[PDB]
Design a protein around this nucleic acid. Structure first.
Ligand SMILES: [K+]
Ligand SMILES: [Mg+2]
Ligand SMILES: [Mg+2]
Ligand SMILES: [Mg+2]
Ligand SMILES: [Mg+2]
Ligand SMILES: [Mg+2]
Ligand SMILES: [Mg+2]
Ligand SMILES: [Mg+2]
Ligand SMILES: [Mg+2]
Ligand SMILES: [Mg+2]
Ligand SMILES: [Mg+2]
Ligand SMILES: [Mg+2]
Ligand SMILES: [Mg+2]
Ligand SMILES: [Mg+2]
Ligand SMILES: [Mg+2]
Ligand SMILES: [Mg+2]
Ligand SMILES: [Mg+2]
Ligand SMILES: [Mg+2]
Ligand SMILES: [Mg+2]
Ligand SMILES: [Mg+2]
Ligand SMILES: [Mg+2]
Ligand SMILES: [Mg+2]
Ligand SMILES: [Mg+2]
Ligand SMILES: [Mg+2]
Ligand SMILES: [Mg+2]
Ligand SMILES: [Mg+2]
Ligand SMILES: [Mg+2]
Ligand SMILES: [Mg+2]
Ligand SMILES: [Mg+2]
Ligand SMILES: [Mg+2]
Ligand SMILES: [Mg+2]
Ligand SMILES: [Mg+2]
Ligand SMILES: [Mg+2]
Ligand SMILES: [Mg+2]
Ligand SMILES: [Mg+2]
Ligand SMILES: [Mg+2]
Ligand SMILES: [Mg+2]
Ligand SMILES: [Mg+2]
Ligand SMILES: [Mg+2]
Ligand SMILES: [Mg+2]
Ligand SMILES: [Mg+2]
Ligand SMILES: [Mg+2]
Ligand SMILES: [Mg+2]
Ligand SMILES: [Mg+2]
Ligand SMILES: [Mg+2]
Ligand SMILES: [Mg+2]
Ligand SMILES: [Mg+2]
Ligand SMILES: [Mg+2]
Ligand SMILES: [Mg+2]
Ligand SMILES: [Mg+2]
Ligand SMILES: [Mg+2]
Ligand SMILES: [Mg+2]
Ligand SMILES: [Mg+2]
Ligand SMILES: [Mg+2]
Ligand SMILES: [Mg+2]
Ligand SMILES: [Mg+2]
Ligand SMILES: [Mg+2]
Ligand SMILES: [Mg+2]
Ligand SMILES: [Mg+2]
Ligand SMILES: [Mg+2]
Ligand SMILES: [Mg+2]
Ligand SMILES: [Mg+2]
Ligand SMILES: [Mg+2]
Ligand SMILES: [Mg+2]
Ligand SMILES: [Mg+2]
Ligand SMILES: [Mg+2]
Ligand SMILES: [Mg+2]
Ligand SMILES: [Mg+2]
Ligand SMILES: [Mg+2]
Ligand SMILES: [Mg+2]
Ligand SMILES: [Mg+2]
Ligand SMILES: [Mg+2]
Ligand SMILES: [Mg+2]
Ligand SMILES: [Mg+2]
Ligand SMILES: [Mg+2]
Ligand SMILES: [Mg+2]
Ligand SMILES: [Mg+2]
Ligand SMILES: [Mg+2]
Ligand SMILES: [Mg+2]
Ligand SMILES: [Mg+2]
Ligand SMILES: [Mg+2]
Ligand SMILES: [Mg+2]
Ligand SMILES: [Mg+2]
Ligand SMILES: [Mg+2]
Ligand SMILES: [Mg+2]
Ligand SMILES: [Mg+2]
Ligand SMILES: [Mg+2]
Ligand SMILES: [Mg+2]
Ligand SMILES: [Mg+2]
Ligand SMILES: [Mg+2]
Ligand SMILES: [Mg+2]
Ligand SMILES: [Mg+2]
Ligand SMILES: [Mg+2]
Ligand SMILES: [Mg+2]
Ligand SMILES: [Mg+2]
Ligand SMILES: [Mg+2]
Ligand SMILES: [Mg+2]
Ligand SMILES: [Mg+2]
Ligand SMILES: [Mg+2]
Ligand SMILES: [Mg+2]
Ligand SMILES: [Mg+2]
Ligand SMILES: [Mg+2]
Ligand SMILES: [Mg+2]
Lengths: 65, 271, 65, 88, 100, 116
RNA sequence: ACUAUGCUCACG
RNA sequence: GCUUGAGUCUCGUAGAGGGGGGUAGAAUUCCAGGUGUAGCGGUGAAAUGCGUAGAGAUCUGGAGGAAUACCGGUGGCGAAGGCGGCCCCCUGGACGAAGACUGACGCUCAGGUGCGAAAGCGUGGGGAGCAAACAGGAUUAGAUACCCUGGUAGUCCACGCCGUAAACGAUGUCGACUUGGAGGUUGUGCCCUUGAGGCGUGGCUUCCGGAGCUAACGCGUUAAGUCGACCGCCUGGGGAGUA
């Protein structure tokens, strides 16, 4: 998070923030995640992941493109 | 402990006794009790100054030691006794050299436990120390407001003071009212909580049980006639008056604190 | 890469922080397994040791102290 | 969960030898030993209902061995109970 | 009976007392059967974050075998003592050596 | 009068506002501005440019103190901040370092209920 | 952003 | 009798299993204190609300409560309900390794009895945040709602009660048997640890699919396949899980 970038540079470049937190504090602990809803919304985000990964093996179809 | 009584008679229906089996079943230690005559509320001039007190069971004064000085002498707790003069139960402490004296019984204390008092000692329930030597954020009782005195604060059953801070010479105490009071660090405080915390769950059950505790009936102002009490008269359950004492001063939210000599010691008033 | 070594086995300990600091990100958070490999058994031991090290002020809880 | 010295002491007493450690006589003593050790644990605590499930397993497990032992041989059944102090 | 791994930290000004403190805690445990397996004074090490509004605590790792009566008497001496800034007491899994 | 060399530009970027507040080294306020104080009200107040102009308005009104270089301390999410720091260069400062003080509670207090 | 309703029965 | 089911001991392995006690850090609210000058707050847009009595912002020092970021996963444990900071105390089970022992001690279970989320209820504590009820501002034809600002019971604790949930894999428990693949997780063997490996074989688990079954959807060695033991339950919709 603590980013100095030497001296001649300036131009922000603080992906250190964007690839660490921000979303963790904000879109999660902004408004209440009703205990069960995480368990629901994760398990569908988890089931959607393996749906794509299992399809990615069977994606090699005829195509003809 | 808290046993509810079976309803074999009306006025034995709602009774709830605080039976302590560990208490003593015998006469108290005679050398440390003198007689204590009853005022009936009246004073020098023979006039009722405090109403609603009169009668009750004859009850002798136990010479309980609050100051708790006799230093550097371990002392075995011989037996826990009943005190009619007090909310809390007392303990007959036998000092190793061969004195006996009464103390307020803390929570975790029993017939056999050893207690020491003074400056060094150990940090354990029953052991009196100066509040300078006692840890911050610790539960004490029987607290002195002035060094060398007896013990004013936290002596009622279940009562305890918590030590919040220590600013040099002064110790900030959070009292059971909620008031944060500043006392001198040289003042003493017996460690732990005052025993018999079930006391509050007792329920008397009859009018008579208040009488034999030395209380007399309170008559309501509204019942009385105008001449007697500010609330008074009216042709059938009237009021239309702001609540007040029998002497006209407003009750029901009206600060009567006006010491002004001790306002320096009070950090935060209770709430 | 993976665990300790070929004949390592061992147990992930909290006292040493040279090898342990590789397993936390620049902010102070714990890095997950799917980035740094590691079998699930050692990732639990690691996590437990990071928290024990945090308690003693060997590792920091964060970088906003 | 009963020390190795505590088990070995009971094993080399009720049974034939230290080798023998599965007799109905032995098994009932090891349950009884542990049940009595747990009475201190359930004197206070009380709300520990998950451990009570393991205790009530041991209790029922014991009674099935004792009831087996009675039907099998009445002589050694009565002698075992006097030594352990069962049947209240 | 049981092995432990005590790791306590001490205030800067009272680091001169630590040689004495170790001698007192050793005498408590070494009397009751179990020996101390390791002696390693870590020294005035920097803190990751301020504890009690100060930096640089004086760490001490004991690592010792003892019964439960002695170790809890030692655990109580840490809380009733302003010199010691925090402590922790780990479980068994045999004795050890080295590592820092 | 005072004439401080360096300071700290605290930026409180919420969804609705962007409150810029330039302080000294020891967290002592010298001046401030807001997206609401710039004009820009309602829908306009929650934008990257309305934060830019607020930082431009906070850049001046601290010229008496004469800060040459400062540290940024962004906070919250907001449409500003990836825009507000651009404004501090273009105004007339040197950014020593950029930081976050976005208060991450370690699962502590129950947040408000979800809105529909 | 929010934003109601559709009287009865009738395709062998 | 026997020893294959079932149980015991022996040495370990993993785990938010439990119960009791501590303590840590972030943050929220608040408390007094410094700085400082108009807004803050909020919204689809506004207003109520809060602020020139000096708020918001910023920093200093406290106090208290509740919950434990990241690790953290189609990960683990628990009979189910459920169970996540770290540390000791007592404690239940699970699995593996090769033996030794017992010798059918077993499986199911009507009544019985225990445990059983959340909400409730009782007595006594505590009370930051959140928030039924409630109030005010919006919205609207109306708005006893949705949105906004406030906000009490409650959520926390100790002890008793309650005995219910879509308490759900909408799938009773135990056991045997019948093609596969990719994994996750925790064991324990054989080999060169000769370098993050080579090769088996036990637990538990997620996904896809064969025969077979199924009304179909789908299930599919963790069966809804093929059989056995025992239990519970069903017999059109409303009336009614009501009187
Ligand atoms: K419940
Ligand atoms: Mg859930
Ligand atoms: Mg006279
Ligand atoms: Mg007289
Ligand atoms: Mg007279
Ligand atoms: Mg009276
Ligand atoms: Mg009389
Ligand atoms: Mg009296
Ligand atoms: Mg009296
Ligand atoms: Mg009294
Ligand atoms: Mg003086
Ligand atoms: Mg009265
Ligand atoms: Mg009355
Ligand atoms: Mg009255
Ligand atoms: Mg009258
Ligand atoms: Mg009169
Ligand atoms: Mg009058
Ligand atoms: Mg009248
Ligand atoms: Mg009337
Ligand atoms: Mg009237
Ligand atoms: Mg008047
Ligand atoms: Mg008057
Ligand atoms: Mg009057
Ligand atoms: Mg009041
Ligand atoms: Mg057992
Ligand atoms: Mg066992
Ligand atoms: Mg035999
Ligand atoms: Mg039977
Ligand atoms: Mg109509
Ligand atoms: Mg119609
Ligand atoms: Mg129609
Ligand atoms: Mg055999
Ligand atoms: Mg088995
Ligand atoms: Mg091993
Ligand atoms: Mg565990
Ligand atoms: Mg364990
Ligand atoms: Mg546990
Ligand atoms: Mg627990
Ligand atoms: Mg607990
Ligand atoms: Mg803190
Ligand atoms: Mg705080
Ligand atoms: Mg003041
Ligand atoms: Mg003020
Ligand atoms: Mg207005
Ligand atoms: Mg107004
Ligand atoms: Mg104003
Ligand atoms: Mg005002
Ligand atoms: Mg002012
Ligand atoms: Mg202020
Ligand atoms: Mg403020
Ligand atoms: Mg503070
Ligand atoms: Mg605190
Ligand atoms: Mg499991
Ligand atoms: Mg099950
Ligand atoms: Mg304990
Ligand atoms: Mg089981
Ligand atoms: Mg067992
Ligand atoms: Mg085997
Ligand atoms: Mg036979
Ligand atoms: Mg045989
Ligand atoms: Mg049944
Ligand atoms: Mg039944
Ligand atoms: Mg029950
Ligand atoms: Mg329960
Ligand atoms: Mg219950
Ligand atoms: Mg509840
Ligand atoms: Mg209640
Ligand atoms: Mg009531
Ligand atoms: Mg009351
Ligand atoms: Mg409140
Ligand atoms: Mg609220
Ligand atoms: Mg609301
Ligand atoms: Mg309402
Ligand atoms: Mg109003
Ligand atoms: Mg309303
Ligand atoms: Mg209206
Ligand atoms: Mg609020
Ligand atoms: Mg809690
Ligand atoms: Mg508790
Ligand atoms: Mg409890
Ligand atoms: Mg019941
Ligand atoms: Mg039931
Ligand atoms: Mg039901
Ligand atoms: Mg469920
Ligand atoms: Mg489910
Ligand atoms: Mg499945
Ligand atoms: Mg059902
Ligand atoms: Mg069963
Ligand atoms: Mg097995
Ligand atoms: Mg098929
Ligand atoms: Mg069929
Ligand atoms: Mg089909
Ligand atoms: Mg199935
Ligand atoms: Mg099979
Ligand atoms: Mg098979
Ligand atoms: Mg199998
Ligand atoms: Mg099966
Ligand atoms: Mg089947
Ligand atoms: Mg079917
Ligand atoms: Mg029927
Ligand atoms: Mg019917
Ligand atoms: Mg019918
Ligand atoms: Mg009914």
């Amino acid at each position: 998070i603590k980013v100095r970038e030497n001296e001649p540079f300036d131009v922000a470049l603080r992906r250190f923030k964007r690839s660490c937190e921000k979303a963790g504090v904000l879109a999660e602990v902004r408004r209440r995640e009703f205990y069960e809803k995480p368990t629901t919304e994760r398990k569908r985000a988890k089931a959607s992941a393996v749906k794509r990964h299992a399809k990615k093996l069977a994606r090699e179809n005829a195509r003809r493109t | 402990a808290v046993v509810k009584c079976k309803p074999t008679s009306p006025g034995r229906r709602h009774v709830v006794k605080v039976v302590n089996p560990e208490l003593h079943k015998g006469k108290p230690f005679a050398p440390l009790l003198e007689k204590n005559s009853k005022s009936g509320g009246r004073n020098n001039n023979g006039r009722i100054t405090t109403r609603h007190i009169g009668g009750g069971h004859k009850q002798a004064y136990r010479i309980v030691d609050f100051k708790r000085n006799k230093d550097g002498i371990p002392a075995v707790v011989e037996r826990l006794e009943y005190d009619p003069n007090r909310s809390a139960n007392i303990a007959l402490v036998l000092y190793k050299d061969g004195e006996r004296r009464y103390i307020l019984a803390p929570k975790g204390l029993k017939a056999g436990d050893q207690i020491q008092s003074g400056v060094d000692a150990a940090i354990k329930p029953g052991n009196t120390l100066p509040m300078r030597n006692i840890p911050v954020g610790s539960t004490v009782h029987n607290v002195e407001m002035k060094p060398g005195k007896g013990g004013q604060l936290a002596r009622s059953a279940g009562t305890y003071v918590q030590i919040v801070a220590r600013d040099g010479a002064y110790v900030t105490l959070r009292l059971r009212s909620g008031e944060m009071r500043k006392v001198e660090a040289d003042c003493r405080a017996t460690l732990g909580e005052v025993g018999n915390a079930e006391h509050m769950l007792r329920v008397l059950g009859k009018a008579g049980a208040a009488r034999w505790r030395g209380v007399r009936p309170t008559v309501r102002g509204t019942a009385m006639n105008p001449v007697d009490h500010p609330h008074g008269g009216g042709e059938g359950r009237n009021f239309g008056k702001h609540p007040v004492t029998p002497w006209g001063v407003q009750t029901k939210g009206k600060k009567t604190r006006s010491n002004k000599r001790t306002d320096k010691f009070i950090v935060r008033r209770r709430s | 890469f993976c665990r300790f070594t070929a004949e390592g086995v061992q147990e992930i300990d909290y006292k040493d922080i040279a090898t342990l600091k590789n397993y936390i990100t620049e902010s102070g958070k714990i890095v997950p397994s799917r980035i740094t490999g590691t079998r699930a058994k050692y990732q639990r031991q690691l996590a437990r040791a990071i928290k024990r090290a945090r308690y003693l002020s060997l590792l920091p809880y964060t970088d906003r102290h | 969960s009963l020390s190795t010295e505590a088990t070995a002491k009971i094993v080399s007493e009720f049974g034939r030898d230290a080798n023998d450690t599965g007799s109905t006589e032995v098994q009932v003593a090891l349950l009884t030993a542990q049940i009595n050790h747990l009475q201190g644990h359930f004197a206070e605590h009380k709300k520990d209902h998950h451990s009570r499930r393991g205790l009530l397993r041991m209790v029922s497990q014991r009674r099935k061995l004792l009831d087996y032992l009675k039907r099998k041989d009445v002589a050694r059944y009565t002698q075992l109970i006097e030594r352990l102090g069962l049947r209240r | 009976m049981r092995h432990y791994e005590i790791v306590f930290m001490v205030h800067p000004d009272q680091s001169e007392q630590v040689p004495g403190m170790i001698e007192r805690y050793t005498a408590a445990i070494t009397g009751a059967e179990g020996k101390i397996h390791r002696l390693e004074d870590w020294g005035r090490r920097q803190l990751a974050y301020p504890i009690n509004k100060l930096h640089k605590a004086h760490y001490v790792l004991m690592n010792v075998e003892a019964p439960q009566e002695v170790i809890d008497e030692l655990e109580t001496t840490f809380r009733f003592n302003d010199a010691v800034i925090r402590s922790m007491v780990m479980r068994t899994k045999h004795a050890v050596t080295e590592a820092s | 009068r005072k004439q401080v060399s360096d300071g700290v530009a605290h930026i409180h970027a919420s969804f609705n506002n962007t409150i810029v507040t330039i302080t000294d080294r020891q967290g002592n306020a010298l001046g401030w501005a807001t997206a609401g104080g710039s004009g820009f009200r309602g829908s306009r107040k929650s934008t990257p440019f309305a934060a830019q102009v607020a930082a431009e308005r906070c850049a001046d009104a601290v010229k008496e103190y004469g800060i040459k270089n400062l540290e940024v301390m962004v906070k919250g999410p907001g449409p500003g901040r990836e825009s507000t720091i651009r404004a501090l260069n273009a105004a007339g400062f040197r950014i020593t370092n950029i930081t976050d003080v976005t208060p991450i509670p370690h699962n502590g207090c129950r947040p408000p209920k979800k809105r529909r």
